[PDB]
Design a binder for this molecule. Structure first.
Ligand SMILES: [Zn+2]
Ligand SMILES: [Zn+2]
Lengths: 361, 361
């Protein structure tokens, strides 16, 4: 396989379906990436992650650069070998969780994580898709602060590009994505898109939109922001999201997604179904012998009842977290498969309407 | 298969190896039963429990009779269906954890759990091997109190027998074990063995010895206590134990074992190896790329390093509990397999010596 090749096989409106071919595997798009917060997708063996249909996972960098440390993971053979996942891994830059979980300057953030150090950490982990180091502008932001933040991020995008390219093994085997910023402002989104395309990246993320602005506003910003990106490269909406967010983002040209919702909320008792989410802890499930979802093909829904999973979660049992997480990730992957197939068949608009009618009934 | 058939295929000294055939499967003896505290072997899917080699699990009754309740589990189809384990389950009486986790009388314990109610709860769960309801005499015990406790337990053993036999479906499909008590006193152990054999049971447990008396004293009591039991029925040492305890108990005629040590201590970071236990949290493992044990055939030792499991456990990650638990239960099952094979081949005494020489090196 090549280092990186994105091919679009079918289109419907702004929606696209296709593949990204990388050295460690093929990624079917639109793609959902389960999140590994600290070298594990919580409560799942990697073979179970793969069994749900995931082609690629997102590895957070922030925790690993603190413990065990990027150099130690490299010494142990890289993140893939360490955690036992041999397919592509996309790593974030570590900057976002540095702020959320500090002194910012033009050189980077002290808490020193510079663009150069972020790229190096992602190299030491052995990332397949490296994210440029930037700032996720807070929401809401004044136009002046959004502009200042975006402009710095574009300077850091060039520094990220140059650091990536300076390291032969990384440039030849990994890919690099740039991140569009600009808050909710069309002119800043355009300037950011232009700056990133001038630098040149393997894919383009839409950053700064998983920030509490609400779906209407997110969709409004995507409406004008995604067309600004190069059409022939993947479009990655970072940190999104709920099932209906994903469907509407695909309708607007997004190819890649990640979020902790299916894993984190799964451990908290929320199960996704085609009839909307349910909280399995609710007393109404105490004697419900049906599976979590009536159509889901996952191993959890083949074998165990709502009643049992209700009992496990209310008991705090580890198997409850395991089963909820496997189902939720499998549900997300089945959603992505239905999206891909419906685009391929030119019936995605109908699928989106049917999905929403039943999910929000 | 029959309701119950214990066959001894080979013997060496007091040690025996053979099979128990029951409706839901064959149990290879000597057997180790992983413990399911509340309708789950903590952090393992049932298919993973089976993959380690377990033929039967122990289901604690105490938590389940409180939540969800025995009647509710019966309404949902029984414990086997509820938790997804279709092979034999041995259930305890619930009385021990009633005391540890109260008003005792001749009728039972209020906290009302009588012998009759304990047998009924185990029936409602769908137990394959039902334990008579008794008292685990505290250690140490005066001869007078040990005698009083043992005598009551023998009255309760007859009540347990009669309750079991009164219920046609249970009498025809499950088995019933009686429990020898008597603390550390030979005369009381003999009276208890005699009383149980007069009543008649499918198997005989040695109760009251997982109670902090130390291995020397446990072995001393087993030396005279196991020969008192019917030779042609299984001998079950409740709540034991560490690997060397199991080896020495088999040397003394025990056929069945259970304890929480491999599961509970696994989640706490203790891994069993043929060179003795290790605490994987110790800094010495932070860069150790070897598997938990150099010879272990389990899936964990095929795929992941000490260094990774060290990281997971020190991070509190659920996958750390999962991997430690699978390895520890697999280690116990491999110990039981080596015991069975060495008895079958007439080299168990040599195996015991070789095992101790390396485990305690
Ligand atoms: Zn499912
Ligand atoms: Zn192992």
């Amino acid at each position: 396989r090549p280092r990186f090749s994105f091919s679009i096989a079918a289109r419907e409106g702004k929606a696209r379906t296709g593949t990204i071919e990388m050295k460690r595997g093929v990624i079917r798009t639109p793609a959902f990436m389960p999140v590994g917060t600290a070298a594990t997708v919580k409560a799942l063996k990697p073979e179970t992650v793969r069994a749900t249909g995931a082609d690629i996972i997102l590895g957070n960098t922030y925790h690993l650069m603190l413990r065990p440390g990027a150099e130690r993971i490299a010494k142990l053979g890289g993140l893939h070998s360490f955690m036992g996942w041999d397919r592509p891994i996309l790593t974030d830059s570590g900057g976002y969780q540095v702020m959320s979980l500090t002194k910012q300057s033009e050189e980077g953030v002290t808490f020193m994580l510079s663009p150069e150090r972020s790229i190096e950490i992602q190299h030491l982990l052995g990332s397949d898709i490296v994210m440029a180091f930037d700032e996720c502008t807070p929401y809401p932001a004044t136009p002046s602060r959004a502009a200042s933040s975006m402009e710095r991020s574009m300077r850091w995008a060039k520094r990220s590009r140059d650091a990536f390219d300076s390291r032969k093994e990384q440039a030849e085997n990994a890919a690099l994505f740039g991140i569009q910023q600009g808050s909710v402002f069309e002119n800043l989104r355009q300037q950011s898109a232009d700056a990133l395309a001038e630098i040149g990246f393997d894919g383009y993320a839409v950053g700064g939109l998983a920030v509490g602005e609400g779906q209407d506003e997110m969709f409004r910003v995507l409406d004008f922001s995604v067309p600004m990106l190069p059409d022939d490269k993947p479009h990655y909406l970072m940190g999104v999201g709920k099932p209906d967010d994903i469907v509407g983002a695909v309708e607007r040209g997004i190819d890649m997604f990640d979020c902790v919702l299916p894993t984190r909320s799964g451990r908290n008792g929320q199960a996704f179904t085609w009839d909307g989410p349910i909280n399995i802890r609710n007393a109404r499930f105490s004697e419900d012998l049906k599976p979590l979802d009536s159509e889901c093909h996952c191993a959890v829904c083949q074998k165990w009842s709502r009643a049992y999973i209700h009992f496990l979660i209310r008991a705090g049992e580890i198997l409850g977290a395991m089963l909820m997480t496997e189902h939720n990730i499998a549900f997300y992957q089945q959603l992505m498969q239905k999206i891909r197939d419906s685009i391929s068949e030119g019936r995605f608009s109908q699928f989106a309407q049917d999905f929403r009618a039943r999910y929000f009934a």
